[PDB]
Amino acid sequence: LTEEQRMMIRELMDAQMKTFDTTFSHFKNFRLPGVSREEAAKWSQVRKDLCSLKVSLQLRGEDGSVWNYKPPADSGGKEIFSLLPHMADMSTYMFKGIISFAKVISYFRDLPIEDQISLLKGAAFELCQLRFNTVFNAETGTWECGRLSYCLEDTAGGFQQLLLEPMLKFHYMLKKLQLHEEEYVLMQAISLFSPDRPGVLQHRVVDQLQEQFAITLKSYIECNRPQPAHRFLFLKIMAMLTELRSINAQHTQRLLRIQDIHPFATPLMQELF
Amino acid sequence: DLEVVAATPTSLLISWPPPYYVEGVTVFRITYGETGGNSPVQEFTVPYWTETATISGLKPGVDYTITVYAEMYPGSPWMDIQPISINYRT
Structure with missing residues (x-):
């Protein structure tokens, strides 16, 4: 591993550690749920996009009190939205971390400013997803985010249903790889x-x-990595990244559809997209 | 300087000059609050490139306080300070 390569990894590692709050200690002040036309049939599509997401939310007290939120079954309502304000805040908090992480890197700073903007806008969701993965528990089916945790509902449905959504499949598949921190950071x-x-x-x-x-x-x-098993591994990771770019496109469409009937998006999210 | 390019009684459009101390800055926090407040402050954040912001839902006839904070990727800097502030009325 060339001295330059070792140096490159060292820089990435530093940026993540400064860049990324694993605890989510500093994530605060988020919104919480409960706290004829046509267009519509846009709505039926929008309902499909929402349906894939849906998660339970758990909050852990400083007391050690736990608050649990269970999302409504679909109805019409505009029930479906209820998480969305909270989700935007989390994404916005994540995004701020992502932006810093880019900022730290010497190579990124060197780049012409317009180029930085394009890369960050393209990057941002994918990087955010990658950071989430580190939290993610496959056995739990949970993302653990300091005091906050998000847990997948079981449609039952199945895993077979569950794996149908690309994003969910990606997290499970990426988790399987059991990457080192260096591997995750490089992917970003x-x-x-x-x-x-x-x-x-x-x-x-x-x-x-x-x-x-x-x-x-x-x-x-x-x-x-001790080689004999692992000969593939780089190829798979590259495959995952390619999958991510496609998923990123899918997400972008979904947000636009959701916004257009519904707007949740924070100013940073609009700026980023 | 921080400028309001345009206003309506509900709504504001605001600008700031780029620093200076960028790169420095991951994002700008923006806070607007009613100028001395009963009101809770409102803050939202935008990418370091952005020179312009929109503030919405404002009461008519109210004098307001608007604050911009510029936020630094760890150990830039350019130090530190200031927040830059203005007041505007419906």
Whole structure:
């Protein structure tokens, strides 16, 4: 592992640790649930998008009191929305962390400012998802977020139903890999620099950076992972990233549909999208 | 300087100059509160690139206080301070 590669990983590790609050100690002041036309049939589609998401929410007291929220079954209502204000706040908090993480990196700062904007807007959901994964518990089916936890409902349905939604499948599949922190952080870097992403002038510079990180990820696994099992692993991770980009597109469509009948989005989210 | 480009009695459009101390800054927090308050303050955040903000739902005839905070990726800096503030009336 070249001294430059080792250095690159060191920088990424520093950024995550400053960048990322695993505790969610500082996440505060979030909103909580309960606290004829046509268009419609837009609504039926929108209901489908909501349906995939749906989670229980748990809050743990400083007391050690626990509050549990169980989401309504669909109705018409506009019941479906109820989480959405809370979710936006969480995403907004996550996004602020994502932006810092990019900011820390020397290579990112070097980039022309317009390029930064394009990359961050493209990146941001994917990076946010990657950070979430580290929290995620496959056995629990929970994301544990400091005091906050979110737990998947069982449609029963099934796993077979559950796996139908790409995002849920991705988290379970990504979790399986049992990545090291270095591996997760590298993925963010590879995701964070994509040449593809819309609005990017400086394709050549980004592609080299993305490639350079990718090699570092490839190198790290061979050195640090005991090889014979793991020969595949880099290929799978790259596959996961490709899946993520597609999922990111799906999410973007979903938000627009949800907003248009319903608007939840925070100013940062609108700015980011 | 912080400027209001446009107003309506409900609603505000506001601008600030870019610093200076960017990169520095991950985001700008923005707080608007009723100018000395019964009111709880409201804060929302925008990307470091953004020079412009929208504030909405305001009462007519009310004098207001608007604060912008610029937020720094850990150990920039450019130190630190100031928040920059204005008051405007419906």
